[PDB]
């Protein structure tokens, strides 16, 4: 029993992080087989980063312009290309610690583990959720560009995120491993705003089931609601609408606890209209939305 | 920027996790050089665990009754001994992935990363604080015993926790790597209850220095206090008393902000006595007590290992 924000063990990714330096600019890269992936803005100078014509800057670079260090060893770049915002540095040595891996694009509301690195050295690991406005609430300082987010299924690492930027509001943005940004952001040195953030409703409900499995029931009530009447109220509070697919994904948690999904929606509607009266749920004073149904099932199955 | 509960990268520990079985009883162990460390109750049957005599139960066992597996590879056991509630099993292969390491016994309030494991396979990692009642608010399922907690300093892994028990209330209890429980618990299949918990004062202060560093400082008052007066007041709110070590580890954050520890204590004292007054700190109206001063430093300064 217990419920905690939990990340995947990150050893398989640790063995892939390297340092990439071009000029006076240094960040992290991801070394898989004989390719090192890193944010392309590493080729920029301070003045370039203001409005980088990346294809122009890139053609003017040579392989020897790129210093790639893996621990003590320096890797020799034998080629360089660009895939959207991701620089691909070819090296003469394949990483022997390359796990089975895949590149995937995560959807909003889904979670992943982030391995935060500095100068190519892993510094910490934590779980994040892709917000509906395609930002993430991470913990990233100068030099963390090139850090990657990932899930693991069996022995296969699914890479979904590479970090590029911190918005003025302090949330974070980045790309998939094909170099496409999540959201409407751009890798230039400008202050950028995200769209209006909404709350991930299916995740809040999963976390309410988790609280019940762990003995917290004070927010429960006898009422039920229709799906549409629930969504009318949820939208009013800037919650995403709950789809029938979401209802279905919650099935296992409904079964385990014996609380129908539409019953638990009536509790959430009461919480949104009434607040929490200074009470807490799983130790939190706010309604937590960064836990997926599957995050809950995998920690609370059998409890 | 941003502030999260962050674990240490756990690769160096994953390469050390193994499975230990005796009869049908299975749990996790820690493979360092040519020794495997694990909870001694692996030698119990389900019925033995009700009222075990571990000395008696161990006299019955030989090296060849112990199944130790790294993945599906068996490590032959060539010696065995018991130290408090930990079993040590000598094996015929020195772990080639052994990191630089040490065994440490941490204080209440200290945090550590937990590598949750099942059948010798790491499954998740998360951060925990040792509560003042010597429990941890963990997330542990059946088969998790022998999971370890650790910190990483430079390249050295400091092991501080081995998992043994879930209490009725849903919190967790265990030992250090020398087999000595944190708290008044015993490894026996019985419902045991922990003392009343308290708030970790040194960590709340750390979190307040964090807020100041970030420009959020409305709560700073013009008062100061003695350490003894603060301790006596803090206890009336269920806050833990500060030690000299606590004052000393707050030193860096005190110098960084220019706010003396006892001045921050007088500010915290006011927050306790008058409440928050509809205001928040770092986004929260709840005072946070599971970040140590090193966590605050490590996260606001990006230290690596
Ligand atoms: C990478 O380390 C750069 O290599 C760095 C990410 C962070 C810096 C602090 N916390 C982080 O996560 N990323 C940047 O510095 C990016 C670089 C771009 C993509 C070329 N820049 C920003 O994130 C950024 C720029 C600006 C800005 O300008 C003007 C104004 C306001 C906010 C802002 N964020
Ligand atoms: C280990 O995996 C045992 O090998 C297991 C830890 C958990 C089980 C569920 N979640 C966990 O973290 N530990 C136990 O099962 C221990 C075994 C002891 C050390 C012999 N027992 C308990 O944790 C336990 C027993 C009882 C109990 O009795 C009856 C009554 C109430 C609570 C309780 N917890």
Swiss-Prot record, chain A:
Cross-linked sites for Glycyl lysine isopeptide (Lys-Gly) (interchain with G-Cter in ubiquitin): 5, 90
Coiled-coil residue spans: none
Cellular compartments annotated: Host cytoplasm; Host Golgi apparatus; Host nucleus
Annotated catalysed reactions: TSAVLQ-|-SGFRK-NH2 and SGVTFQ-|-GKFKK the two peptides corresponding to the two self-cleavage sites of the SARS 3C-like proteinase are the two most reactive peptide substrates. The enzyme exhibits a strong preference for substrates containing Gln at P1 position and Leu at P2 position
Regulation of protein activity: Inhibited by pyridone-containing alpha-ketoamides compounds 13a and 13b. In turn, alpha-ketoamide 13b (tert-butyl (1-((S)-1-(((S)-4-(benzylamino)-3,4-dioxo-1-((S)-2-oxopyrrolidin-3-yl)butan-2-yl)amino)-3-cyclopropyl-1-oxopropan-2-yl)-2-oxo-1,2-dihydropyridin-3-yl)carbamate) inhibits SARS-CoV-2 replication in human lung cells. Inhibited ex vivo by michael acceptor inhibitor N3. Inhibited ex vivo by compound 11a and 11b.
Domain Peptidase C30: 1-303
Superkingdom of source: Viruses
Cytoplasmic side: 1-303
Impact when changing residue 142 to A: Does not affect ability to cleave and inactivate human TRMT1
Active site: 41, 145
Described function: Cleaves the C-terminus of replicase polyprotein at 11 sites. Recognizes substrates containing the core sequence [ILMVF]-Q-|-[SGACN]. Cleaves and inactivates human TRMT1, preventing tRNA guanine(26)-dimethylation of tRNAs. May cleave human NLRP1 in lung epithelial cells, thereby activating the NLRP1 inflammasome pathway. May cleave human GSDMD, triggering alternative GSDME-mediated epithelial cell death upon activation of the NLRP1 inflammasome, which may enhance the release interleukins 1B, 6, 16 and 18. Also able to bind an ADP-ribose-1''-phosphate (ADRP).
Assembly notes: 3CL-PRO exists as monomer and homodimer. Only the homodimer shows catalytic activity. Interacts with host FBXO22; this interaction promotes the proteasomal degradation of nsp5.
Protein name: 3C-like proteinase nsp5
Name of the coding gene: rep
Full-length numbering of the shown residues: 3264 to 3566 of 7096
């Amino acid at each position: 029993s217990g419920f905690r924000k939990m990340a995947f063990p990150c050893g398989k990714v640790e063995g892939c992080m390297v340092q990439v330096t071009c000029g006076t600019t240094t960040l992290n890269g991801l070394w898989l087989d004989d390719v090192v992936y890193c944010p392309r803005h590493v080729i920029c100078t301070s003045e370039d980063m203001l409005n980088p014509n990346y294809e122009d800057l890139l053609i003017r670079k040579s392989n020897h312009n790129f210093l790639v260090q893996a621990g003590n060893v320096q890797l020799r770049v034998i080629g360089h290309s660009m895939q959207n915002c991701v620089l691909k540095l070819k090296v003469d040595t394949a990483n022997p610690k390359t796990p089975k891996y895949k590149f995937v694009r995560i959807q909003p509301g889904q979670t992943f583990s982030v391995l935060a690195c500095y100068n190519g050295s892993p510094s910490g690991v934590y779980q994040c959720a892709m917000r509906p406005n395609f930002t993430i609430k991470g913990s990233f300082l100068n030099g963390s560009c090139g850090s990657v987010g990932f899930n693991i299924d069996y022995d296969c690492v699914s890479f979904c995120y590479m970090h590029h930027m911190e918005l003025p509001t302090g949330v974070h943005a980045g790309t998939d491993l094909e170099g496409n940004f999540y959201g409407p952001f751009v890798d230039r040195q400008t202050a950028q705003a995200a769209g209006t953030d909404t709350t991930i409703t299916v995740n809040v409900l999963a976390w309410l089931y988790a609280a019940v499995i762990n003995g917290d029931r004070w927010f429960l009530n006898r009422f039920t609601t229709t799906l549409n009447d629930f969504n009318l109220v949820a939208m009013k509070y800037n919650y995403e609408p709950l789809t029938q697919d979401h209802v279905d994904i919650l099935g296992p948690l409904s079964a385990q606890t014996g609380i129908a999904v539409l019953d638990m929606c009536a509790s959430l509607k009461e919480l949104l209209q009434n607040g929490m009266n200074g009470r807490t749920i799983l130790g939190s004073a706010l309604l937590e939305d960064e836990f997926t149904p599957f995050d809950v099932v995998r920690q609370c199955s059998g409890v």
